Point group: C2
Chain length 524, copies 2
Amino acid sequence: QGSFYPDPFDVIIIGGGHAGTEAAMAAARMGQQTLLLTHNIDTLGQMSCNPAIGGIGKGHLVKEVDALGGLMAKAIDQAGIQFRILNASKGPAVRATRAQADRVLYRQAVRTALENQPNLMIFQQAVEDLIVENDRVVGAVTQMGLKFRAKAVVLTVGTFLDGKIHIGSIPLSRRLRELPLRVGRLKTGTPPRIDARTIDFSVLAQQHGDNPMPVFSFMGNASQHPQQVPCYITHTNEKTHDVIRSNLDRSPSIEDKVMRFADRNQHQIFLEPEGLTSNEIYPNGISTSLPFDVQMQIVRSMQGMENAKIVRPGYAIEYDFFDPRDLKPTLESKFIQGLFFAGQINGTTGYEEAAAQGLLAGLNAARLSDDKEGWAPARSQAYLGVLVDDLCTLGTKEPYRMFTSRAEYRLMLREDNADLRLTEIGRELGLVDDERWARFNEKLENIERERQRLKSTWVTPSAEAAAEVNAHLTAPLSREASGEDLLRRPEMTYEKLTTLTPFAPALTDEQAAEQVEIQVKYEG
Amino acid sequence: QGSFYPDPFDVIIIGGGHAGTEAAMAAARMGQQTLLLTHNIDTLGQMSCNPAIGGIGKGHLVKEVDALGGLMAKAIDQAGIQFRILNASKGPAVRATRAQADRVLYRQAVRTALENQPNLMIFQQAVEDLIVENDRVVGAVTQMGLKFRAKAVVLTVGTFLDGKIHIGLDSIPLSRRLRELPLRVGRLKTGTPPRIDARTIDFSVLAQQHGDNPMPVFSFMGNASQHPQQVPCYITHTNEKTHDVIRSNLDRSPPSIEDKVMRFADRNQHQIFLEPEGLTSNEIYPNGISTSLPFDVQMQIVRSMQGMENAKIVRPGYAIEYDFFDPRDLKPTLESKFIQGLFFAGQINGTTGYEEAAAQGLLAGLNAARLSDDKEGWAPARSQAYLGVLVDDLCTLGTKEPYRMFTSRAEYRLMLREDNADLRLTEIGRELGLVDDERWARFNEKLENIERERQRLKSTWVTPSAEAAAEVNAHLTAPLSREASGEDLLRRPEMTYEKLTTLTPFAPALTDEQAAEQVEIQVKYEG
């Protein structure tokens, strides 16, 4: 004990981040001795912004993170309340699941799992600085003094201020800024968080989860889900704006989103419930550095909340962060062998990218430790890929704006097939459990077997129940057609096509249906 | 809007303490327009010592806080993973209830409860400073910049810090202004053990201590069911090597176990209690080995102990020093004697039990509110309630009475029991504004319920023959010479109300389960 925890570690994860969690979680499951040092087991799982996981891109990420072994899917499987599916009527590729989260519930699940994970050991401590020998890392020194020996270390930097709070010193810093690493500003903000009791919920418009409910992870089902709920929708107006502009001489915002526009348009606002057990309401998109009175003026002027009382004021922070252009696309910093950077440090914000980077950066470092080799997944393997790339190259995630268009080109990069795409690279890599592995096969055998059995089976306009088929189609059977051939046909859906007597039975595997269908209506 | 949130309040509670809570909860439920400022909503319910509520005297203090209508009692019920009645055979003066909290649960419960309560606006900032006009408070100013006017403020502190934490040897004008008045300051210095991962522990060899069946309930309105699942607690001890380690290591930094030793022998083993940190947590609170001794020391201390040979430490033990003003500059109402309408409750006064702050807050909130609507602080009779005692002492003496003492004094005080705080207090509650219909209601039902039942325990005797002078005289020791009434036969230390009403002269058992048990006590300890 050179003052030196007696035990040595394969991977150190510095920070109880989304990234951190996913990192820690993986390196563990891969088989490594991994230790996670968060300065607050209690904020473990905290959600910095709105209480929501997924949507366009994000969801893709999560679906991916999931197949790869990860957590954040389950997590939000257990703690969402409302499970829309964006772009539902727009054909795979740009279809995206998007859940709301009972913070407490989520938080609980990140932890219970983090805490319950063979090979991961948790330890409450600030990290003082790293210990770097030959421009390799070999552990760090926690601020209490203690020092831990490891072979790779994933800097993270999660849930931990500083950054400056705007509503109107650690050797580990100094060290990095001493190397080449180039350092950016990053301007994340926040709504005044609002009081359910003071909000009039009648004169406002509901929005409800999909039926049946969407599960998020491949492995889960909607039983796992908790109680579900509305989110009420209020809107904006001239008044709102006068205020803003009237107060603009006082510094993603609304003090942004409203200088570049013009009230002829009413910005639509979302009251998202921070959870099954709290009168706190997140007014989605009215984040602000605008001073308190303004915030109120604003919260106050819209419909439903003429008498709203604010519970916690809005405010914006300024982060610094280390431009990731100096990362390898395994994440491993280019300067300090074995030290990777996932998370908000690289300058992204969203929980899902974070989670995803973390999955890698762990996985990678977790390998380095077993003297093996970085995966680096291909910009066409998965969005985890399109991200990391975009990040190391232009160092900045691809605007979501783009996602939609851009997605035509990508097109196999789809929520519905992450498991396919990634889950054996998973298994092979080390990240997938005997019992996910053995289902993902079932979801294969069940697809191959019953997709060849959908061309293997035709209907002549001549055999018995030819006339029963001819009811559903466009211009009844003129050729010995196979079910596949007619599934492709715009009116018909796999569910009905199993109904008709030559193409029964249906398929039990609710998913391998789903996939078979998605595949067939989009393969040519 | 000046610089000044629009609406004024009657009463502002500064700092979402225990004391902090309990005050806000009072003033509000007296219909006062009550502002609860706090730097972090997600901490309401924080138990910073071990995850337990009450026990001897602490118990007492809770059940009073209950009768008076505050939260703690209800909370711990809502979140209790273990219930025991200490001194169960020792007679009512000194029976106490204590319970193990699921840290989260509790925290939930206390939040949800302040969140959902008529007249209380919670609003999350830290406080810069008081606003003072002519030695009267009149408002707080938040960090932010926001100012609130109130008519009375309760200063509280808790939930927060600072501290200089020591683990082995290792600015807000409100602090300044305070000190510029003649306030006698003290340091006071709580610590904490090192919190231990439940997996690294061999529970198979330790013995374990369960709750009471049937299951105690803390508040007077609680029902048994209401309680979470119930786990056991685990018991390992310390021993020679352990100590040998503490001693040899003492030359590092300055309740604690390195103190429980510097003060004894040491075969001389000390029962150490492995307390579940939650129902959904893997951390164990090793209750009794707190420290400021350095990490390895701590590790060695843990690992020396049976069961923990392999244990690994999730959170490291340590100790904090708190500044804290001497409560002798408070009127017996906790109104401060230097700035009026300023009230000091809980730890800012130097107490550091929870219960003890829970009680202080209640009354601070009370007399704060009262002042809001110009009344006169209640200042509770030392003979009325331990609440009474406690507060007296922080003004007489500047300090809480010791628990060491509690069992002797015990029987000078004596009407002051747990089993009867409602009886003692709820009533004074009603008139003070502290009690709720839901309760008032029950209380009086119990109240007549017992009356009615005492009467009829004289309105009923056995003449040594006739009817079932048979059935009866077998249960006793020495059969009745002549007349003896129900109540006479019960004072007899061999006969339990429950068995007394399984007799055809004296049945049928009163159904008001509470009243029933109080009837018993009242009778067996009347004098």
